[PDB]
Amino acid sequence: SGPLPKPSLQALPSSLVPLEKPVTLRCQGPPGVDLYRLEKLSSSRYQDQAVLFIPAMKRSLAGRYRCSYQNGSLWSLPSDQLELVATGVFAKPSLSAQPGSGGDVTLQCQTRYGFDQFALYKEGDPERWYRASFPIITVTAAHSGTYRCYSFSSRDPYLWSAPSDPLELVVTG
Ligand SMILES: *[C@@H]1O[C@H](CO)[C@@H](O)[C@H](O)[C@H]1NC(C)=O
Ligand SMILES: [Cl-]
Ligand SMILES: [Cl-]
Ligand SMILES: [Cl-]
Numbered sequence: 001s002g003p004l005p006k007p008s009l010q011a012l013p014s015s016l017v018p019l020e021k022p023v024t025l026r027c028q029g030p031p032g033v034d035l036y037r038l039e040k041l042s043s044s045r046y047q048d049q050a051v052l053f054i055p056a057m058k059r060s061l062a063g064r065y066r067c068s069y070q071n072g073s074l075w076s077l078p079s080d081q082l083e084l085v086a087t088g089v090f091a092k093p094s095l096s097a098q099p100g101s102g103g104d105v106t107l108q109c110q111t112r113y114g115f116d117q118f119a120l121y122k123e124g125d126p127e128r129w130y131r132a133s134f135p136i137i138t139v140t141a142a143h144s145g146t147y148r149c150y151s152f153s154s155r156d157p158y159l160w161s162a163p164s165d166p167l168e169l170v171v172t173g
């Protein structure tokens, strides 16, 4: 007999978690299943409950998580892997911005360490995210708003810097 459809695995309030802040991971499949199994891939340790409450985020809790449920003798396909990120592990980078060509805006996420990954975002609902393997990013048709940037290493991509101080982009003439 074949497996069941995958559950979802979600971090609330967010999967981007500052060190020392709370996060809850929740596995959710169909109503009435018999067992949920939630694991962390780095340790291959697991708990047989759908909910994991982390009162205060730690570096060692960052990384990929996955869950499956069982019903009868049958297992589900596993969830998409949740990528739990610890922020604030390293000093914050410095974010600057300049007009580019046309409506392009150049954002620079500058650091002292030798980082090779950078995530930039504009506050809002929804948030606009940009990610790059180099510290200069061109945002095409950039929107006005509040931007911040994180730096990290591709060798452990789940441990991020503190976010940069905000920069305010005013596109309106
Ligand atoms: C779980 O198994 C029971 C029968 O043992 C069945 O009634 C129910 O619909 C199953 N649930 C899912 C989500 O497949
Ligand atoms: Cl199925
Ligand atoms: Cl969920
Ligand atoms: Cl955030």
Ligand SMILES: [Cl-]
Residues within 6 Å of the ligand: 088, 089, 090
């Ligand atoms: Cl630290």
Ligand SMILES: [Cl-]
Residues within 6 Å of the ligand: 099, 100, 101, 104, 105, 106, 107, 137, 138, 139
């Ligand atoms: Cl540019």
